[PDB]
Design a protein around this ligand. Structure first.
Ligand SMILES: Nc1nc2c(ncn2[C@@H]2O[C@H](COP(=O)(O)OP(=O)(O)O)[C@@H](O)[C@H]2O)c(=O)[nH]1
Ligand SMILES: [Mg+2]
Length: 167
C-alpha cells in the first residue's frame, strides 16, 4: 500500500556501481556470486517518509532518453536523481558537470538531485577526497553522501534523504 509514487533516475559513468546501488536498496543484498550478468536496470520499493507510504521507482537509465520516447518522458517526470561517481576513479568525478547538465536539461524544475560517491569500502584506493566533492555539492545545491553498495553503508540514507527533501 502507498499514497504516492516517486520516479528516480540513476546516472553516471560506466562501472561506478549504479546497478549495485539499485540492487542493494530494493533487494537488501550485494551479489558477489553473479558477476556474469549484465546488471539490474530497473526496480521498485515502498518506503515510509514523514508518516507517508511512498512507492519508489528506480531506473538505471543508461542514456536511453536520447532514443526511447517512454524513457524520454520518465526522465521529464523524475522526482529525484542520484548522480554517481567512483571514489577510486577520478575520471568519473571529472565528468560530473556533464552528468549535471544532462540531469537539469532533461528533467523538470522540481527534480531533487543527490551526489553519491560510491565504493567507500575501498579505503586504501581512494582517489577523490570527501572535501572536494562536498564543495562541488554545496556549490550546486546538491545533497551529498559517500556510500558503499557492497557493504550497504549509507545506501538506505541515500534514497531516503532524497525522498524527505522531495517532501
Ligand atoms: N568494492 C565495491 N565494488 C562495487 C561497489 N559497487 C559496485 N561494485 C562493483 O563495480 C562493478 C560495476 O558495478 P555496476 O553496478 O554494474 O556499475 P554500473 O555500470 O554503474 O551499473 C561490479 O563489478 C561491482 O561488483 C561498491 O560499493 N564497492
Ligand atoms: Mg548498470
Amino acid at each position: 500500500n502507498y499514497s504516492y509514487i516517486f520516479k528516480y533516475i540513476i546516472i553516471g559513468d560506466m562501472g561506478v556501481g549504479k546497478s549495485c546501488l539499485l540492487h542493494q536498496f530494493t533487494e537488501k543484498k550485494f551479489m558477489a556470486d553473479c558477476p556474469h550478468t549484465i546488471g539490474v536496470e530497473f526496480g521498485t520499493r515502498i518506503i515510509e517518509v514523514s508518516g507517508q507510504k511512498i512507492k519508489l521507482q528506480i531506473w538505471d537509465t543508461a542514456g536511453q532518453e536520447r532514443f526511447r520516447a517512454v524513457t524520454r518522458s520518465y526522465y521529464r517526470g523524475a522526482a529525484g536523481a542520484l548522480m554517481v561517481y567512483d571514489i577510486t576513479r577520478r575520471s568519473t568525478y571529472n565528468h560530473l558537470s556533464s552528468w549535471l547538465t544532462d540531469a537539469r536539461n532533461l528533467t523538470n524544475p522540481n527534480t531533487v538531485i543527490i551526489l553519491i560517491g560510491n565504493k567507500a569500502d575501498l579505503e586504501a584506493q581512494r582517489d577523490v577526497t570527501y572535501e572536494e566533492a562536498k564543495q562541488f555539492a554545496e556549490e550546486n545545491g546538491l545533497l551529498f553522501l559517500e556510500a558503499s553498495a557492497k557493504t550497504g553503508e549509507n545506501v538506505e540514507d541515500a534514497f531516503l534523504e532524497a525522498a524527505k527533501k522531495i517532501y
